[PDB]
Each structure stands twice: as C-alpha cells, then as structure tokens.
Amino acid sequence: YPLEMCSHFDADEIKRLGKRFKKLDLDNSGSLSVEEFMSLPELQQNPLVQRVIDIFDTDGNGEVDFKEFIEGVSQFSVKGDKEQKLRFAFRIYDMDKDGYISNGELFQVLKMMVGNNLKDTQLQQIVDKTIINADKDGDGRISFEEFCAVVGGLD
Amino acid sequence: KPKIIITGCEDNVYEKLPEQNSNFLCVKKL
Amino acid sequence: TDRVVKAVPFPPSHRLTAKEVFDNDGKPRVDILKAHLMKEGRLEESVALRIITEGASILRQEKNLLDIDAPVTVCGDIHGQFFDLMKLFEVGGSPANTRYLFLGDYVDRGYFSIECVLYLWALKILYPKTLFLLRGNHECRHLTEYFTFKQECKIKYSERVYDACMDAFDCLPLAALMNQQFLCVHGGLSPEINTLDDIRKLDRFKEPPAYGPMCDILWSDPLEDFGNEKTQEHFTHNTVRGCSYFYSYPAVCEFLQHNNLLSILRAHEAQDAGYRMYRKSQTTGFPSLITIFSAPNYLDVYNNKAAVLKYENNVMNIRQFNCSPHPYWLPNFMDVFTWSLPFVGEKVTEMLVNVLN
Ligand SMILES: [Ca+2]
Ligand SMILES: [Ca+2]
Ligand SMILES: [Ca+2]
Ligand SMILES: [Ca+2]
C-alpha cells in the first residue's frame, strides 16, 4: 500500500517525514534503533520514549522502519479522531499488546514514569485500588472499554 | 477532685513521601 | 498473576452483604466489619446506608446534652485516621466493656473517613447506651465538600452515602455532662452559652450556622495565651478560624464557677503530646480546660502523639499513643490513569515534536 493510505498523511507529508527519518537513521540500516532515538538530547530525560518505540515497532523486531515510523506518527496527526488517541494512550500501558492492561503492566509503566517519586509499596497500593474501581467484569485486568470509562472525559 | 496520671508511649515510626523529582511524574503537594 | 509487589496486601473486591454484616437479630458483626475495613474492603452500598441510617435513628433520640458517667474513655479528633482509631480502642479499652465519648471530627484530612464513620456507627448500634458520639465542626456539609470527605464517599461509595452521613451528622449531640463534673464539647464556649440550659434549648438538627451558640460550641478555641491574658475580653473574634471566638481563662473560670463544674474537656486543636491541660481555676485548684487530640502523626507529618482520657475510680488517666501504618492514596483519591495521562500526553508530544523537529 502507498503510505498515504496507511496514515492521515498526504504525499507531501510523507516526503518530509522521509527526510527526518534519514537524518535519524545514523547507519543507513533503514531502521531506527532505540540508540538512534537517544542520540537526540531532547529525548534524554523522557521516560515515555521506550514505550513509544515499542508501540511503533509493530513487527516486534526492536527497531522502527520507515513504514512503522509513518504509521506511528500518524496516531498523532491533528486528523486523528478521539478514539485513535484513546487507543494510543491505552497502548502506552498495555506492554504485551494483548489488549488488556494487567496489574503488573500498570505498575511497571507507572514505575517508568514516577521513578523514585513513590516507593514500590506505595505505587502497588494505588495501582491495586485503581484496578478494583475500574475493573467492571472482575477479571483483575483493565479492558479498553474499562479504560475509556475512567479517562474518556479528560480529553 | 480527680487525680491526674499520664501514661506515656513510644515515638512515632512512619514512612515519609519521597522528595518529588520534577523530571518524573510527581505527586502534587497537599 | 503478574502483580509485582506482594509486600503489600491486595484489598478484597467483594462487597460485604447484609447477611455478612448483620446477624439474625439485627446486630452488626463489628469484628467482621473491623477486619474487612482494615483491609480497605467495602460494603454493599445498601449495607453502608443501613448502618448510617440506623445509627442516625439512635442519635436522633439522644438529647443535645448527654449525661455520661464514669468510667468512660473520652476521645478527641480522629480525622479519618482509621488505622489509628484501631489502636485507640486497644489503648482505651474494648467498647464491649468500656463506655466511650468521642468529641467529634471523625472525617476529613485522613483518607479513611468513611471507614471511621461506618465502624463507629456500627458500634453505636451495638452499644447504644455506652458508646457516645458528639458533633465536631467537620461533621457538616460545608467542610466535607471543601475537604475530602465528599470526594471520598463519591469514589468509594456514592453521594447517596454522603447524604446519609450529612443527615446522620445533623443528629449528633452537641455536648456531654460527664460525672456531673465535666462539660465536654468539641470546640468550647460561647458568649451565648451561660448555663447548661442554653445548650439544652438549641435546635441541633441542621447544618451548623456560621454564627451563634451552635457554631461556637463546635468552633471556638482558647486564646493562644489562655491563662496569661493581657486584657480581659472574655470572647474575641477567632482570627484563625474566621468565625466564632477565642475564649479567655476568666471566661472559662466564670462559666465553671457559675454552673458548679470542674472543667471543660474539648478537642478541635492538634497537640504535640496528644493533650494539653491549661491553668488551674482559682476556685477549684483543677485545670480549667483540657484539650484531647486523638490523631497521632496528624496529616502524616505533624509527628505528634495522640491521647485519650480515661476517667475511672476518681483518676483521670491521660493515655498517649503513637501512629500506625496505613495504606497510601494519591491526593483526592485520584486513580493512576487520571494521574499519569497528562504526563503521558506531555512526554509523548515532547518526544515527537523533537523527533520531527
Ligand atoms: Ca539505523
Ligand atoms: Ca520493527
Ligand atoms: Ca497486556
Ligand atoms: Ca476487567
């Protein structure tokens, strides 16, 4: 498929995105490694970088090729709808990509974000209670619909 | 007139919230 | 599961039913309730409503001014510190065989306020003639909407439980006369309370007004320099609370003298030691005022001791106690999604703006 049919982007946008991808691909491998993203100072103290890369990496080979790059950034186009943004936010927490946020995933992802700002015991307690309150079907994990019920109004 | 008697106890032992590093997700101060 | 930290308990999700909470004769099973609440377990909403409303019905039949005789354990502010309330009963004696008087402020500040209310109300149902509860200034709509009790009810139960509590709080008595010796109130005196009859005549079944004797009973404080006054204004505007008054040592002594009382026992102000005895009255040789504060390490940072006052065999035994561990909550009971999503949005936007330059 042409990439403008796999994203919110037109051909002009694809070409520009290509120019940035090339600049980031330091070894002309045709894929971006985590190390290549980290070469940007601005991404330095950013706990979300690892998660975004993992989400972009749809074939799970640890790197981001140009198609993955385009489809990843597309999820943040101004032309993306509310549902797409909620889906991306959910994906931040759903580490193993099975479509549910488990207790362990929620803890690990929050721990990436909070660092030492909370003790593990404190963080576990608030993760547990978030899940108890949001888990409507009692399976101990958070579905996409359960997630949206919590955050849908935040915009 | 009642007699007053104080019965003591040990000091508090408790966890304090970590200092909040603004480079990470922080708990808002109460 | 894949839960990472087993070093803390996972709270029960099961909501206790009426059959689990009430025995066949309508008696609350307070031991089950204690254990479930200490685990941060919840009741079915209908069961919580039943405890609150049954307690209210009992309170509604009580007088504004209770008569309570020794032996009795008198307790000050609790402020939602449920895990300290558990220690309080160990220090003060089991309510199964100990008379209790609580001086109010069950809720706000601490994030286990509804557990405090449910457990104390259950105890009131079980021990209607030996466990007594007075109103504090936080037992109202105004403060509970400003502080966190209303939100606590919203997140753990619903606003129906909150409303039931507001009605129940309207029913709380305002004062006790203990051993025909001690006037016990949450806050203190009023320029409009000159005899005990002035308390008896009040209509307490309402949100406390911003002015007048009911307000003052709940809100007033002794002067900072109580007992060492430089003027002799008996009552002056309470610049700390923004309503009601500061009362002076001569104000207290004149009231005690007139009404042939020994002392005023009250709460309402944090104390590093959990208590404070003020200057002896010139007509009794006994402290004119005693503050009792039953919330150890208040706000998790004061590092104060708490105390109760056990009056028995003509001995007033002030028993101090220290704090107990309690579970963590984010401010305003915020869930971790609501908490982290803005940070997620900011950092992901940050990343991509810079990746795309
Ligand atoms: Ca490369
Ligand atoms: Ca890939
Ligand atoms: Ca998952
Ligand atoms: Ca679920």
PDB file of C-alpha atoms in Angstrom, chain C residues 157-345:
ATOM      1  CA  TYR C 157     -19.445   4.524  47.550  1.00  0.00           C
ATOM      2  CA  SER C 158     -21.650   7.263  46.120  1.00  0.00           C
ATOM      3  CA  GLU C 159     -23.133  10.642  47.005  1.00  0.00           C
ATOM      4  CA  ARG C 160     -26.089   8.692  48.460  1.00  0.00           C
ATOM      5  CA  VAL C 161     -23.784   7.536  51.258  1.00  0.00           C
ATOM      6  CA  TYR C 162     -22.503  11.102  51.647  1.00  0.00           C
ATOM      7  CA  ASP C 163     -26.065  12.472  52.002  1.00  0.00           C
ATOM      8  CA  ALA C 164     -26.907   9.786  54.557  1.00  0.00           C
ATOM      9  CA  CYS C 165     -23.851  10.847  56.555  1.00  0.00           C
ATOM     10  CA  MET C 166     -24.893  14.513  56.362  1.00  0.00           C
ATOM     11  CA  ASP C 167     -28.306  13.681  57.865  1.00  0.00           C
ATOM     12  CA  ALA C 168     -26.680  11.459  60.467  1.00  0.00           C
ATOM     13  CA  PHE C 169     -24.249  14.248  61.407  1.00  0.00           C
ATOM     14  CA  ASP C 170     -27.207  16.638  61.896  1.00  0.00           C
ATOM     15  CA  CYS C 171     -28.395  14.171  64.561  1.00  0.00           C
ATOM     16  CA  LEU C 172     -25.138  14.131  66.540  1.00  0.00           C
ATOM     17  CA  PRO C 173     -25.443  15.522  70.081  1.00  0.00           C
ATOM     18  CA  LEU C 174     -23.520  18.702  70.835  1.00  0.00           C
ATOM     19  CA  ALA C 175     -22.208  18.142  74.373  1.00  0.00           C
ATOM     20  CA  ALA C 176     -21.946  15.831  77.350  1.00  0.00           C
ATOM     21  CA  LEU C 177     -22.104  16.402  81.073  1.00  0.00           C
ATOM     22  CA  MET C 178     -19.744  13.819  82.467  1.00  0.00           C
ATOM     23  CA  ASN C 179     -19.990  12.636  86.089  1.00  0.00           C
ATOM     24  CA  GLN C 180     -21.953  15.850  86.749  1.00  0.00           C
ATOM     25  CA  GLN C 181     -18.467  17.459  86.789  1.00  0.00           C
ATOM     26  CA  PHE C 182     -17.197  17.988  83.256  1.00  0.00           C
ATOM     27  CA  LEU C 183     -18.677  19.787  80.290  1.00  0.00           C
ATOM     28  CA  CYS C 184     -17.433  18.024  77.169  1.00  0.00           C
ATOM     29  CA  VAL C 185     -17.711  19.731  73.766  1.00  0.00           C
ATOM     30  CA  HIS C 186     -15.743  19.721  70.512  1.00  0.00           C
ATOM     31  CA  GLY C 187     -14.721  23.395  70.460  1.00  0.00           C
ATOM     32  CA  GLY C 188     -15.705  25.276  73.570  1.00  0.00           C
ATOM     33  CA  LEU C 189     -17.744  28.109  74.995  1.00  0.00           C
ATOM     34  CA  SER C 190     -19.912  30.842  73.516  1.00  0.00           C
ATOM     35  CA  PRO C 191     -20.875  34.319  74.631  1.00  0.00           C
ATOM     36  CA  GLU C 192     -24.417  32.902  74.271  1.00  0.00           C
ATOM     37  CA  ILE C 193     -23.864  29.834  76.440  1.00  0.00           C
ATOM     38  CA  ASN C 194     -24.004  30.896  80.063  1.00  0.00           C
ATOM     39  CA  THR C 195     -25.688  27.842  81.599  1.00  0.00           C
ATOM     40  CA  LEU C 196     -26.166  24.229  80.551  1.00  0.00           C
ATOM     41  CA  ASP C 197     -29.811  25.059  79.736  1.00  0.00           C
ATOM     42  CA  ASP C 198     -28.516  27.264  76.927  1.00  0.00           C
ATOM     43  CA  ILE C 199     -27.230  24.064  75.288  1.00  0.00           C
ATOM     44  CA  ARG C 200     -30.413  22.108  76.064  1.00  0.00           C
ATOM     45  CA  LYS C 201     -32.611  24.683  74.304  1.00  0.00           C
ATOM     46  CA  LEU C 202     -30.754  24.593  70.959  1.00  0.00           C
ATOM     47  CA  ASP C 203     -32.174  23.112  67.760  1.00  0.00           C
ATOM     48  CA  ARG C 204     -29.229  20.980  66.610  1.00  0.00           C
ATOM     49  CA  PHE C 205     -30.934  19.230  63.705  1.00  0.00           C
ATOM     50  CA  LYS C 206     -29.433  21.309  60.909  1.00  0.00           C
ATOM     51  CA  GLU C 207     -26.244  22.277  59.126  1.00  0.00           C
ATOM     52  CA  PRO C 208     -24.336  24.344  61.711  1.00  0.00           C
ATOM     53  CA  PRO C 209     -24.876  28.084  61.187  1.00  0.00           C
ATOM     54  CA  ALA C 210     -21.946  30.422  60.558  1.00  0.00           C
ATOM     55  CA  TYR C 211     -22.905  32.331  63.764  1.00  0.00           C
ATOM     56  CA  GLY C 212     -24.382  31.732  67.191  1.00  0.00           C
ATOM     57  CA  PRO C 213     -24.203  29.218  70.044  1.00  0.00           C
ATOM     58  CA  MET C 214     -24.275  26.014  67.991  1.00  0.00           C
ATOM     59  CA  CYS C 215     -21.490  27.382  65.779  1.00  0.00           C
ATOM     60  CA  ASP C 216     -19.449  28.414  68.821  1.00  0.00           C
ATOM     61  CA  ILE C 217     -19.771  25.051  70.590  1.00  0.00           C
ATOM     62  CA  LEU C 218     -18.215  23.397  67.550  1.00  0.00           C
ATOM     63  CA  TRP C 219     -15.735  26.124  66.544  1.00  0.00           C
ATOM     64  CA  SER C 220     -14.383  28.168  69.456  1.00  0.00           C
ATOM     65  CA  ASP C 221     -10.803  27.916  70.837  1.00  0.00           C
ATOM     66  CA  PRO C 222      -8.961  29.111  73.921  1.00  0.00           C
ATOM     67  CA  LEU C 223      -6.712  32.154  73.413  1.00  0.00           C
ATOM     68  CA  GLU C 224      -3.134  31.338  72.484  1.00  0.00           C
ATOM     69  CA  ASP C 225      -2.124  32.978  75.771  1.00  0.00           C
ATOM     70  CA  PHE C 226      -5.001  31.420  77.730  1.00  0.00           C
ATOM     71  CA  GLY C 227      -4.273  31.838  81.452  1.00  0.00           C
ATOM     72  CA  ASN C 228      -1.857  34.717  80.805  1.00  0.00           C
ATOM     73  CA  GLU C 229      -4.161  37.297  79.221  1.00  0.00           C
ATOM     74  CA  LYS C 230      -3.102  40.939  78.848  1.00  0.00           C
ATOM     75  CA  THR C 231      -6.673  42.220  78.574  1.00  0.00           C
ATOM     76  CA  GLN C 232      -9.883  40.727  79.933  1.00  0.00           C
ATOM     77  CA  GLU C 233     -12.061  40.453  76.855  1.00  0.00           C
ATOM     78  CA  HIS C 234     -13.833  37.154  77.563  1.00  0.00           C
ATOM     79  CA  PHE C 235     -14.626  36.462  73.907  1.00  0.00           C
ATOM     80  CA  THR C 236     -12.834  37.929  70.901  1.00  0.00           C
ATOM     81  CA  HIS C 237     -13.188  37.161  67.194  1.00  0.00           C
ATOM     82  CA  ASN C 238     -11.388  33.941  66.222  1.00  0.00           C
ATOM     83  CA  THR C 239      -8.958  35.257  63.623  1.00  0.00           C
ATOM     84  CA  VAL C 240      -7.639  31.727  62.990  1.00  0.00           C
ATOM     85  CA  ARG C 241     -10.977  30.052  62.203  1.00  0.00           C
ATOM     86  CA  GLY C 242     -12.511  33.177  60.636  1.00  0.00           C
ATOM     87  CA  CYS C 243     -15.707  32.547  62.603  1.00  0.00           C
ATOM     88  CA  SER C 244     -16.716  32.155  66.260  1.00  0.00           C
ATOM     89  CA  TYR C 245     -14.421  33.184  69.114  1.00  0.00           C
ATOM     90  CA  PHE C 246     -11.379  32.783  71.256  1.00  0.00           C
ATOM     91  CA  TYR C 247     -12.356  32.367  74.905  1.00  0.00           C
ATOM     92  CA  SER C 248     -10.262  33.521  77.847  1.00  0.00           C
ATOM     93  CA  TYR C 249      -9.307  31.883  81.143  1.00  0.00           C
ATOM     94  CA  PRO C 250     -11.586  34.253  83.102  1.00  0.00           C
ATOM     95  CA  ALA C 251     -14.405  33.361  80.667  1.00  0.00           C
ATOM     96  CA  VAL C 252     -13.923  29.665  81.370  1.00  0.00           C
ATOM     97  CA  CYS C 253     -13.494  30.087  85.130  1.00  0.00           C
ATOM     98  CA  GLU C 254     -16.601  32.285  85.402  1.00  0.00           C
ATOM     99  CA  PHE C 255     -18.642  29.711  83.482  1.00  0.00           C
ATOM    100  CA  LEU C 256     -17.357  26.798  85.586  1.00  0.00           C
ATOM    101  CA  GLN C 257     -17.936  28.734  88.808  1.00  0.00           C
ATOM    102  CA  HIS C 258     -21.459  29.813  87.894  1.00  0.00           C
ATOM    103  CA  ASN C 259     -22.503  26.296  86.831  1.00  0.00           C
ATOM    104  CA  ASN C 260     -20.601  24.431  89.553  1.00  0.00           C
ATOM    105  CA  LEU C 261     -18.490  22.479  87.083  1.00  0.00           C
ATOM    106  CA  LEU C 262     -14.915  21.286  87.488  1.00  0.00           C
ATOM    107  CA  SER C 263     -13.539  21.608  83.964  1.00  0.00           C
ATOM    108  CA  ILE C 264     -14.179  21.817  80.258  1.00  0.00           C
ATOM    109  CA  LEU C 265     -12.959  18.877  78.176  1.00  0.00           C
ATOM    110  CA  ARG C 266     -12.654  19.609  74.454  1.00  0.00           C
ATOM    111  CA  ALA C 267     -10.739  18.740  71.275  1.00  0.00           C
ATOM    112  CA  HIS C 268     -10.512  20.707  67.983  1.00  0.00           C
ATOM    113  CA  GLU C 269      -6.768  21.672  68.181  1.00  0.00           C
ATOM    114  CA  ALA C 270      -3.761  19.488  67.382  1.00  0.00           C
ATOM    115  CA  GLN C 271      -1.430  18.916  70.325  1.00  0.00           C
ATOM    116  CA  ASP C 272       2.160  17.637  70.092  1.00  0.00           C
ATOM    117  CA  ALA C 273       1.567  15.451  73.157  1.00  0.00           C
ATOM    118  CA  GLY C 274      -1.999  14.482  72.217  1.00  0.00           C
ATOM    119  CA  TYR C 275      -3.322  16.609  75.084  1.00  0.00           C
ATOM    120  CA  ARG C 276      -2.974  19.864  76.964  1.00  0.00           C
ATOM    121  CA  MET C 277      -4.087  20.852  80.458  1.00  0.00           C
ATOM    122  CA  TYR C 278      -4.460  24.575  80.955  1.00  0.00           C
ATOM    123  CA  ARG C 279      -4.239  26.829  84.011  1.00  0.00           C
ATOM    124  CA  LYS C 280      -5.998  25.723  87.196  1.00  0.00           C
ATOM    125  CA  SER C 281      -9.162  27.594  88.083  1.00  0.00           C
ATOM    126  CA  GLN C 282      -8.845  29.837  91.134  1.00  0.00           C
ATOM    127  CA  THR C 283     -11.951  28.267  92.691  1.00  0.00           C
ATOM    128  CA  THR C 284     -11.221  24.550  92.145  1.00  0.00           C
ATOM    129  CA  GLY C 285      -7.443  24.044  92.041  1.00  0.00           C
ATOM    130  CA  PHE C 286      -8.068  21.880  88.969  1.00  0.00           C
ATOM    131  CA  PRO C 287      -7.192  22.604  85.317  1.00  0.00           C
ATOM    132  CA  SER C 288      -9.898  24.876  83.893  1.00  0.00           C
ATOM    133  CA  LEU C 289      -9.638  23.387  80.403  1.00  0.00           C
ATOM    134  CA  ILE C 290      -8.287  20.191  78.864  1.00  0.00           C
ATOM    135  CA  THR C 291      -7.777  19.568  75.133  1.00  0.00           C
ATOM    136  CA  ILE C 292      -7.657  15.962  73.892  1.00  0.00           C
ATOM    137  CA  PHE C 293      -6.439  15.129  70.399  1.00  0.00           C
ATOM    138  CA  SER C 294      -6.651  11.535  69.214  1.00  0.00           C
ATOM    139  CA  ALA C 295      -4.999  11.650  65.775  1.00  0.00           C
ATOM    140  CA  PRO C 296      -1.327  10.653  66.061  1.00  0.00           C
ATOM    141  CA  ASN C 297       1.116  11.937  63.430  1.00  0.00           C
ATOM    142  CA  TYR C 298      -1.632  14.173  62.083  1.00  0.00           C
ATOM    143  CA  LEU C 299      -1.577  14.683  58.304  1.00  0.00           C
ATOM    144  CA  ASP C 300       1.264  12.110  58.275  1.00  0.00           C
ATOM    145  CA  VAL C 301       3.710  14.917  59.122  1.00  0.00           C
ATOM    146  CA  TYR C 302       2.953  16.574  62.487  1.00  0.00           C
ATOM    147  CA  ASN C 303       4.781  13.792  64.348  1.00  0.00           C
ATOM    148  CA  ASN C 304       2.520  14.395  67.341  1.00  0.00           C
ATOM    149  CA  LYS C 305       1.453  11.810  69.861  1.00  0.00           C
ATOM    150  CA  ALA C 306      -2.274  11.186  70.328  1.00  0.00           C
ATOM    151  CA  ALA C 307      -4.092  10.687  73.619  1.00  0.00           C
ATOM    152  CA  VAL C 308      -7.346   9.564  75.145  1.00  0.00           C
ATOM    153  CA  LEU C 309      -8.558  10.414  78.642  1.00  0.00           C
ATOM    154  CA  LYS C 310      -9.794   7.509  80.696  1.00  0.00           C
ATOM    155  CA  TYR C 311     -11.768   8.673  83.716  1.00  0.00           C
ATOM    156  CA  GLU C 312     -12.218   5.925  86.299  1.00  0.00           C
ATOM    157  CA  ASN C 313     -12.005   5.470  90.082  1.00  0.00           C
ATOM    158  CA  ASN C 314     -11.546   9.224  90.508  1.00  0.00           C
ATOM    159  CA  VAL C 315      -8.400   9.133  88.377  1.00  0.00           C
ATOM    160  CA  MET C 316      -8.093  10.959  85.054  1.00  0.00           C
ATOM    161  CA  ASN C 317      -5.640   8.800  83.137  1.00  0.00           C
ATOM    162  CA  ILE C 318      -4.314  10.509  80.003  1.00  0.00           C
ATOM    163  CA  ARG C 319      -3.056   7.692  77.825  1.00  0.00           C
ATOM    164  CA  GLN C 320      -0.811   8.632  74.940  1.00  0.00           C
ATOM    165  CA  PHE C 321      -0.372   6.578  71.815  1.00  0.00           C
ATOM    166  CA  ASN C 322       1.620   6.697  68.591  1.00  0.00           C
ATOM    167  CA  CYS C 323       0.703   6.202  64.931  1.00  0.00           C
ATOM    168  CA  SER C 324       0.068   3.000  62.996  1.00  0.00           C
ATOM    169  CA  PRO C 325       0.810   2.151  59.366  1.00  0.00           C
ATOM    170  CA  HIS C 326      -1.902   2.897  56.783  1.00  0.00           C
ATOM    171  CA  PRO C 327      -2.311   2.389  53.026  1.00  0.00           C
ATOM    172  CA  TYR C 328      -1.352   5.059  50.512  1.00  0.00           C
ATOM    173  CA  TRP C 329      -3.753   7.082  48.346  1.00  0.00           C
ATOM    174  CA  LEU C 330      -2.986   9.749  45.762  1.00  0.00           C
ATOM    175  CA  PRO C 331      -4.303  13.204  46.698  1.00  0.00           C
ATOM    176  CA  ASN C 332      -8.091  13.474  46.279  1.00  0.00           C
ATOM    177  CA  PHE C 333      -8.322   9.692  45.677  1.00  0.00           C
ATOM    178  CA  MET C 334      -7.155  10.148  42.091  1.00  0.00           C
ATOM    179  CA  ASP C 335      -6.739   6.918  40.129  1.00  0.00           C
ATOM    180  CA  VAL C 336      -3.390   6.252  38.410  1.00  0.00           C
ATOM    181  CA  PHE C 337      -4.794   6.720  34.887  1.00  0.00           C
ATOM    182  CA  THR C 338      -6.175  10.207  35.638  1.00  0.00           C
ATOM    183  CA  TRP C 339      -2.883  10.983  37.404  1.00  0.00           C
ATOM    184  CA  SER C 340      -0.481   9.820  34.693  1.00  0.00           C
ATOM    185  CA  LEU C 341      -2.345  10.543  31.437  1.00  0.00           C
ATOM    186  CA  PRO C 342      -1.471  14.261  31.378  1.00  0.00           C
ATOM    187  CA  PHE C 343       2.198  13.326  31.880  1.00  0.00           C
ATOM    188  CA  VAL C 344       1.928  10.703  29.137  1.00  0.00           C
ATOM    189  CA  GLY C 345       0.461  13.273  26.763  1.00  0.00           C
TER     190      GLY C 345
END
